[PDB]
Amino acid sequence: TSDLIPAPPLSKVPLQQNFQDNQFQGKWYVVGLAGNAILREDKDPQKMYATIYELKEDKSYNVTSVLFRKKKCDYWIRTFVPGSQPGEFTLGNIKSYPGLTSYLVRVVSTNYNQHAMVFFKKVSQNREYFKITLYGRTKELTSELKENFIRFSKSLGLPENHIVFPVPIDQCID
Ligand SMILES: COC(=O)[C@H](CCCCN(O)C(C)=O)NC(=O)[C@@H](CCCCN(O)C(C)=O)NC(=O)c1cccc(O)c1O
Ligand SMILES: [Fe+3]
Ligand code: NA
């Protein structure tokens, strides 16, 4: 019913040193997308989408994804609660997602004003899913940065067809 490439040990997912949560606020474009449930589809290629991070009084993030689907904009909202160390988070109100028993976020690297790599891992219906997002402050990033993403995705066991670069669009995400 399902076959998944295993989640890597956390020992080989770096953590961004000295994480500045206020500086990580704002809109990010998903320019690179990889994971064990992520699969390249040339018939119907992945459209680019955007994720907005905004701190609250209590320093949790209100994370809002906006994506273009069925000729409309869909708004996926959830809370990231600070975890064991800075740059590391857990999901708030996990109770509202049936089957979901675990959720981890980890900021691998970022220069705040241009690019970022973030690692996600969830366990749901006892199935362990993980993904890496290549966040871009603009819709385009350099070749260097994208290969860096490609080769990092591979260091966690992902083949080429599990790595995608969503195609830039104008609807919803601007
Ligand atoms: C992550 O971005 C994505 O491309 C889409 C977002 C959906 C947007 C679609 N839509 O609503 C639109 C276009 O309007 N979703 C995933 O690929 C799922 C696959 C696992 C599904 C688990 N599952 O329920 C099954 C049946 O396989 N998610 C993850 O792989 C995943 C892994 C770790 C942490 C997460 O939070 C995840 O979501
Ligand atoms: Fe998700
Ligand atoms: Na270049």
- Domain of 28, in residue numbers: 1-174
Q: Which of 38, 58, 130, 120 is nearest to 87 (CA)?
A: 120
Decide: 127 in ligand 1 pocket, CB within 6 A: no
Decide: 120 in ligand 1 pocket, CB within 6 A: yes
On whether the CB atoms of residues 22 and 55 are closer than 8 A, the answer is yes
CATH code, domain with 81:
2.40.128.20
- Determine the Cα–Cα distance for residues 42 and 32; give it in Å rounded to an integer: 15
If you take atom 5 of ligand 1, which residue's CA is the nearest one? 38
Ligand nearest to the CA of 140: 3
On whether the CB atoms of residues 19 and 107 are closer than 8 A, the answer is yes
Q: Was 43 annotated as part of a binding site?
A: no
The technique is X-ray
- DSSP readout, 148-161? HHHHHHHHTT--GG
Ligand 1 atom closest to the Cα of residue 69 is 14
Q: Scanning the structure block, which residue is given the tokens 């089957």?
A: 99
Length of the chain: 174
On whether the CB atoms of residues 112 and 134 are closer than 8 A, the answer is no
Decide: 69 in ligand 1 pocket, CB within 6 A: yes
Q: Which of 9, 26, 7 is nearest to 116 (CA)?
A: 26
Q: How many domains does the chain have?
A: 1
DSSP 8-class letter at 145? H
